[PDB]
Amino acid sequence: SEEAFIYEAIRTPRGKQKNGSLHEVKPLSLVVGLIDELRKRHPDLDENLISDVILGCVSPVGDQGGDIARAAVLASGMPVTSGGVQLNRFCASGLEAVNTAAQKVRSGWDDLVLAGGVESMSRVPMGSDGGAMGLDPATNYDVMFVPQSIGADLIATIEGFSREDVDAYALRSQQKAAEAWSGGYFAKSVVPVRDQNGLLILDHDEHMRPDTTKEGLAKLKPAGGFDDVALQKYHWVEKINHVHTGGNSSGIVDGAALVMIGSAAAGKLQGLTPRARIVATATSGADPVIMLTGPTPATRKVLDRAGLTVDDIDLFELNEAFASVVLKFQKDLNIPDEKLNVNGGAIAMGHPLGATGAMILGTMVDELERRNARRALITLCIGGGMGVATIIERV
């Protein structure tokens, strides 16, 4: 019934893993910093009308345990009635939080919802939470658990993506990310992180290597017998071509992102101006061994659900977990090259698991408005073989 609109979409800069600027910053502080920015954007906002705060977090332990979303509500002084829930759907958690917020707004039982995610991978490395799919031999031996990097190398082997092909995609991601920063595209959405004294800690995406060359990408080296496990299922493949390095894979970084979502009435009541409308969401899946093929049926599903086709979509934003995944996605749906990840992706700027979905979502909200374009489709692959997709329409 109700229509869900995006009113604000902001994110922190992404600090790198080794000697990163955000390593001294607790993930709770990353979220609270963005809450304080929204207050600066709308100081007359009646926070009592915020009914929930939904955060994605893939490793909710230690600094990220104990429902970090509720911690953000209390630490930031938001009303105690503003809720706070943590969710984990692996890489899509940030976008799942946005989709869930939109679906709660559509049901009419939530008025104004904050959504996003947070992941401080330099403080809480992935796998810190444990898990049965990895640490239980009975079920690990059955689901054929394989790290996602090997799934990506397998995709490049089947589709025929050479080492030069995946490095060529990594290069343009660096080029397009550098062009977006220098062009001022991110000047409004990337909120610099500061300490309790106001001193600057970080104001840009440290993981970026804008002086990347194709010759440098070739010098890089690729990354338990998991190769034999994957080839046991994909038996028609004799050998996996390991083409993925740290230069054509997503960067491990720290960051957080927030998105404010509400109904037209909820925004009008609070003097907010809508920026985009959530058209449709979808969730699908694919092979759990190859792992990173979920986005293709999830994108197909969200298009049929909205009565749209690829030709109706202006921008395609797929998370750059690995270069072959994006090239597989581009090849399958025949995505024009000038519509895909136009402002660079995780290869250049980093992939802070729980926050990524909300970051690339807000990235398309800005780019649609900047280009004065109509529709954008956002999707992420997920560990375990899942897929989430979202279509937004500029307003």
């Binding site: 607790k26 403080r123 106001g198």
Partner: protein
């Protein structure tokens, strides 16, 4: 990245570190700041250590070990308070960079690949101990007066030169915070070695540097692989008590902030919680990341208001008092031989104990030998508790009690050159008691009176030598309360001021000098504190809220509890004397609203703890709880003001009352007002004193004297004209 403060472009600071390299390749850094008698962590030190640390790296091939020593009576004490008290919020970047540069030098010294030994010849406090903690081995000389610790929390700061980070990695979060950091405890060298702060002791200072170079030579020969490597820089390091991610410490970690909040009673003291945050956060990351977090919390405290309050009082105000700020200029000395205390009550018995503990022969007289004997038992009871705690020997305790001679005969005051009377608060009684003794004591004896309210000028007429009559006001319990309020009568000579001034320092207490006026400073100001609370009780405010308000304001005792020990009958005749002075001069007395509550409790037969019942209930000599009939008597709950309004009313009443004492000439300096309110009546240390509270007030509407007046006018419009500020505070 640099070891220096500047890296661009007249005037440079002097050198404070002497360099010496022996034939073995052991460099001896001898800190000797020519600008003072104590090495301090100022801009001259930072530049001097920067050159030395640069030189240690450049000549590392010809250097085998380092020794850090001092040429002063002390080792190294404190930082530049004059600079840190001027740090505005905009100066946070400079403060941050300074401590980051200071720790960058100590970190290079620490990771030199060579053993560094600290030769601690004297006191190593604050920044001094932080330099020693950066060394791999610490040797101290067990000399008299030597103290070691990190007492910056007492100034509203934290150990920002690695003190937090290193102690936590030496002792774990809990032990470092509880034993060293949270209260800035000082340690004698023997205690320092016992807790792990110091490794070895020597009997004299001349053995230090040789023993240091000896330990270097043996450490190189015995442990060549781990020489100059701190425990936390080894691959298998495991923090004592665990890291915040260890299951054992994680089970009790969330209770650390609540326990600290229990200790502080909800008072707004930010430095302890900043230390706890830096400690825990630092234990989650590497040493260098931990150190940088330590700098950010430090800069947060230095630019805050509470640290400026505390630095103003406990450093500048205290130093001015201890330097004879209130003492008459040209007066000599006059040593004391025999002290004569009149009265064996809680006050007189406590005065005789602190006088005997200082090494004086005391004659403790009372109306009966049984009474004087039970007075000396107060000293025996404290000595017996210090024997069990192991703070004094049986031989030293026996000599202490042997200086107390309990008597009932006035002739036993023969040869006494210092009289301290502590009898009942009654003029003609003190007149009588002094008359019975003025001719038996020495003709040059000081005639001191422990009076709470009666003016000294009137008490002086009961003796012959009024020039030697003076008010020497102590505070219960005397063995713990550190202030002595010296009251100058109209006839009191300037020499008598100095003798009581010198006596106060001899017994280890802090003096203030006050001109004669009923209520003096302490009693008058503390009256407005309890009167505001009794007003709230009469207005219908819940007693539990009033007590909570007093504790969260920062007071050591909630006001209803304190009223039960001041005795409400004494509060009654205080107002009766005030009412008589106004109505005899023809004026009309405006009674404080608390007076109606006092007379009410008197009528109900609950005049305080001394008579068994007051605002609380008392059984077996202990306080039981709030009297249940209190709510019904005053309709408690019918008035529910904000807690901050209750808190501010108590603080502002004393702050405003202090300003009057300064205006009327009762006090002579703001230093005496601040320390006098903190050490005398228990004004919260975070305010820096009742005078500093005005110039450094911080509320939601602003900061400073202007914001104080606005809040005082806010309180006056809602609670009464008594909160209106004097003209001295207005523009």
């Amino acid at each position: 990245s640099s070891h220096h403060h500047h890296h661009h472009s007249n005037s440079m600071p002097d050198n404070t570190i002497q360099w010496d390299k022996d034939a073995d390749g052991i460099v001896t850094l001898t800190m000797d700041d020519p600008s003072g008698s104590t090495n301090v962590m100022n801009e001259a030190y930072i530049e001097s250590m920067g050159k030395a640390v640069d030189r240690l790296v450049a000549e590392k091939d010809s250097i085998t070990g380092v020794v850090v020593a001092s040429a002063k009576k002390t080792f190294f004490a404190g930082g530049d308070v004059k600079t840190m008290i001027q740090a505005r919020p905009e100066d946070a970047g400079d403060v941050f960079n300074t401590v980051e540069t200071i720790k960058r030098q100590l970190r290079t010294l620490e990771t030199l690949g060579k053993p560094v030994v600290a030769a601690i010849n004297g006191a190593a406090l604050g920044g001094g101990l932080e330099i020693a903690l950066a060394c791999h081995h610490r040797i101290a000389a067990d000399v008299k007066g030597s103290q070691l610790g990190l007492p910056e929390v007492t100034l509203g700061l934290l150990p920002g030169g690695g003190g937090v980070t290193r102690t936590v990695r030496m002792f774990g979060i809990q032990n470092a915070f509880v034993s060293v950091l949270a209260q800035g405890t000082r340690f004698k060298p023997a205690k320092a070695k016992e807790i792990g702060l110091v490794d070895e002791l020597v009997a004299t200072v001349e053995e230090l540097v040789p023993a240091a170079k000896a330990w270097i030579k043996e450490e190189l020969k015995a442990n060549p692989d781990g020489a100059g490597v701190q425990p936390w820089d080894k691959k298998g390091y495991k923090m004592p008590g665990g890291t915040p991610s260890s299951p054992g410490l994680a089970a009790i970690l969330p209770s650390f902030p609540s326990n600290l909040r229990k200790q502080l009673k909800g008072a707004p003291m930010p430095a302890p919680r900043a230390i706890l945050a830096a400690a825990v956060e630092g234990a989650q990351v590497d040493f260098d990341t931990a150190s940088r977090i330590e700098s950010r919390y430090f800069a947060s405290l230095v630019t805050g208001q509470v640290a400026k309050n505390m630095m103003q009082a406990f450093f500048f105000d205290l130093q001015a008092i201890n330097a004879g700020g209130s003492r008459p200029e040209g007066i000599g000395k006059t040593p004391i031989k025999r002290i004569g205390v009149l009265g064996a009550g809680m006050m007189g018995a406590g005065i005789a104990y602190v006088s005997a503990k200082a090494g004086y022969e005391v004659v403790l007289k009372d109306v009966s030998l049984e009474a004087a004997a039970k007075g000396k038992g107060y000293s025996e009871k404290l000595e017996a508790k210090a024997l069990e705690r192991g703070r004094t020997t049986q031989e030293r305790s026996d000599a202490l009690l042997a200086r107390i001679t309990p008597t009932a005969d006035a002739a036993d005051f023969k040869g006494v050159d210092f009289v301290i009377e502590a009898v009942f608060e009654n003029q003609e009684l003190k007149h009588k008691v002094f008359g019975e003794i003025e001719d038996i004591v020495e003709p040059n004896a000081i005639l001191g009176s422990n009076t709470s309210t009666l003016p000294i000028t009137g008490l002086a007429t009961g003796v012959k030598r009024q020039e030697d009559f003076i008010g020497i006001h102590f505070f219960s319990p005397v063995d713990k309360m550190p202030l002595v309020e010296i009251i100058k009568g109209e006839k009191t000579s300037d020499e008598a001021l100095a003798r009581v001034f010198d006596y106060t320092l001899a017994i280890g207490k802090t003096p203030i000098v006050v001109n004669d006026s009923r209520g003096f400073f302490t009693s008058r100001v503390i009256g407005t504190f309890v009167n505001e609370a009794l007003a709230m009780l009469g207005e219908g405010v819940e007693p539990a809220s009033i007590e909570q308000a007093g504790s969260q304001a920062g007071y050591p005792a909630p006001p209803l509890q304190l009223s039960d020990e001041l005795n409400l009958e004494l509060m009654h005749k205080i107002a009766v004397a005030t009412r008589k002075g106004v109505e005899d001069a023809g004026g009309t007395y405006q009674p404080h609203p608390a007076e109606a509550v006092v007379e009410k409790m008197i009528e109900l037969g609950r005049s305080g703890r001394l008579k068994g019942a007051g605002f609380y209930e008392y059984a077996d000599g202990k306080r039981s709880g709030l009297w249940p009939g209190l709510r019904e008597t005053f309709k408690s709950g019918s008035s529910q003001p904000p807690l901050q309004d209750m808190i501010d009313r108590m603080l502002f009443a004393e702050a405003l009352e202090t300003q009057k004492c300064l205006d009327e000439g009762v006090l002579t300096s703001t230093a005496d007002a601040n320390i006098g309110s903190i050490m005398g009546i228990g004004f919260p240390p975070w305010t820096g004193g009742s005078a500093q509270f005005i110039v450094g007030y911080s509320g939601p509407a602003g900061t400073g004297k202007a914001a104080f007046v606005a809040r005082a006018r806010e309180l006056a419009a809602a609670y009464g004209d008594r909160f209106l500020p004097p003209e001295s505070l207005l523009s």
